[PDB]
Curated annotation (Swiss-Prot):
Residues 62-72, 227-234 are extracellular. The chain crosses the membrane at residues 3-27, 38-61, 73-95, 116-138, 154-178, 203-226, 235-258. One of its GO terms (cellular component) is dendrite. GO terms for molecular function: alpha-actinin binding; calmodulin binding; enzyme binding; G protein-coupled adenosine receptor activity; identical protein binding; lipid binding; protein-containing complex binding; type 5 metabotropic glutamate receptor binding. The keyword Transmembrane helix applies. This is Adenosine receptor A2a. The gene is ADORA2A. The chain holds residues 6 to 303 of 412 of the full protein. Residues 28-37, 96-115, 179-202 are cytoplasmic. One of its GO terms (biological process) is neuron projection morphogenesis. Interacts (via cytoplasmic C-terminal domain) with USP4; the interaction is direct. May interact with DRD4. Interacts with NECAB2. Interacts (via cytoplasmic C-terminal domain) with GAS2L2; interaction enhances receptor-mediated adenylyl cyclase activity. Receptor for adenosine. The activity of this receptor is mediated by G proteins which activate adenylyl cyclase. Belongs to the G-protein coupled receptor 1 family. It comes from Homo sapiens (Human). Keywords: Cell membrane, Disulfide bond, G-protein coupled receptor, Glycoprotein, Membrane, Receptor, Transducer, Transmembrane, Transmembrane helix, Ubl conjugation.
Length: 271
């Protein structure tokens, strides 16, 4: 119990620090203000909020505080909007890499800073609508005690939250990355191509780490929903899955530092 709170607080601190470093690095350095880096800083902002609010909210839900219904749904479902925003940002990054690699000549024409910010705003607005759907409808609410099992319907999680809003973007961007690397192999000028592949590899790792972290908890929810005859998953397994899902927030600043040389140099400059 106490171990969970301590590890969650440590994850929150690490996420805040790493992603504020990423945001500061992109803001400070003009060489790092690409089109893809706008999606990168949107994803960093999503991780910052995961650290600042989503993890304290998870701790409070673990304590099972009683409160009003709508506040309870907001506390339980704030992680959902941030995960969806991360999904949308990762998809935008994958499509940007595909545009940059498959059609380099018209890449600058197709994607523009104003277009990038627009897509970011639309994706952020859609993430709130998808994640906070329980507040509008689909409630098991009927001061209710805040338990994520009792309050948030599992039909929502296993159909709308997961099958349409995670697996579909996950599989689409898996196909996008496969097409990216197939086109990279077809195209092989050589110096520029290896920069695109290296950038695509870096942005595909942070995608692979996201799916690796989130599918444990999603599959546990699917097991809870599809087969009611079997008993509920153990509490320790549930907390481990939550911690694993939260761990994806801290990893990608380290990936940027390790893979992207400009990020590493400006990180060392900041510190
Ligand atoms: C939820 C979905 C999440 C997203 C999934 C995306 C999956 C994408 C798979 C892509 C990938 C695996 C490695 C990817 C990185 C790790 C990913 C996992 C990280 C987990 C933490 C296999 O991709 C191929 O895999 C084959 C099977 O092995 C398939 O067959 C192919 O269709 C597929 O494209 C890429 O492998 C390789 O692709 C090639 C270019 O093609 C890269 O460039 C090669 O070297 C360059 C000089 O260095 C040259 O300049 C370039 O000319 C040369 O070709 C390689 O360096 C390497 O990268
Ligand atoms: N299923 C589930 N449970 C929880 N917390 C409930 C933990 C619990 C589980 C069993 C129990 O008897 C008492 C408490 N948070 C959860 N977050 C998510 C989630 C976030 C994104 C997708 O699923 N699913 N999820």
């Amino acid at each position: 119990s106490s171990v969970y709170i301590t590890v969650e607080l440590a994850i929150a601190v690490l996420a805040i620090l790493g992603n504020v470093l990423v945001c500061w690095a992109v803001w400070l350095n003009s060489n790092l203000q690409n089109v893809t880096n706008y999606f990168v800083v949107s994803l960093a902002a999503a991780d910052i909020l995961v650290g600042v609010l989503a993890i304290p909210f998870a701790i409070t839900i673990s304590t099972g505080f009683c409160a009003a219904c709508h506040g309870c749904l907001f506390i339980a479902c704030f992680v959902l909007v941030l995960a969806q925003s991360s999904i949308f940002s990762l998809l935008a990054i994958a499509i940007d890499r595909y545009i940059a690699i498959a059609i380099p000549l018209r890449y600058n024409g197709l994607v523009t800073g104003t277009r990038a910010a627009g897509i970011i705003a639309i994706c952020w607005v859609l993430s709130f609508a998808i994640g906070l759907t329980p507040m509008l409808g689909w409630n098991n609410c009927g001061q209710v005690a805040c338990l994520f099992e009792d309050v948030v319907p599992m039909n929502y999680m296993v159909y709308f939250n997961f099958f349409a809003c995670v697996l579909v973007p996950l599989l689409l961007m898996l196909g996008v990355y496969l097409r990216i690397f197939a086109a990279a192999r077809r195209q092989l000028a050589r110096s520029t191509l290896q920069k695109e592949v290296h950038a695509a590899k870096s942005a595909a790792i942070i995608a692979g780490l996201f799916a690796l972290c989130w599918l444990p908890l999603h599959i546990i929810n699917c097991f809870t929903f599809f087969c009611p005859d079997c008993s509920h998953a153990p509490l320790w397994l549930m907390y481990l899955a939550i911690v694993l899902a939260h761990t994806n927030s801290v990893v990608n600043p380290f990936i940027y530092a390790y893979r992207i040389r400009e990020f590493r140099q400006t990180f060392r400059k900041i510190i």
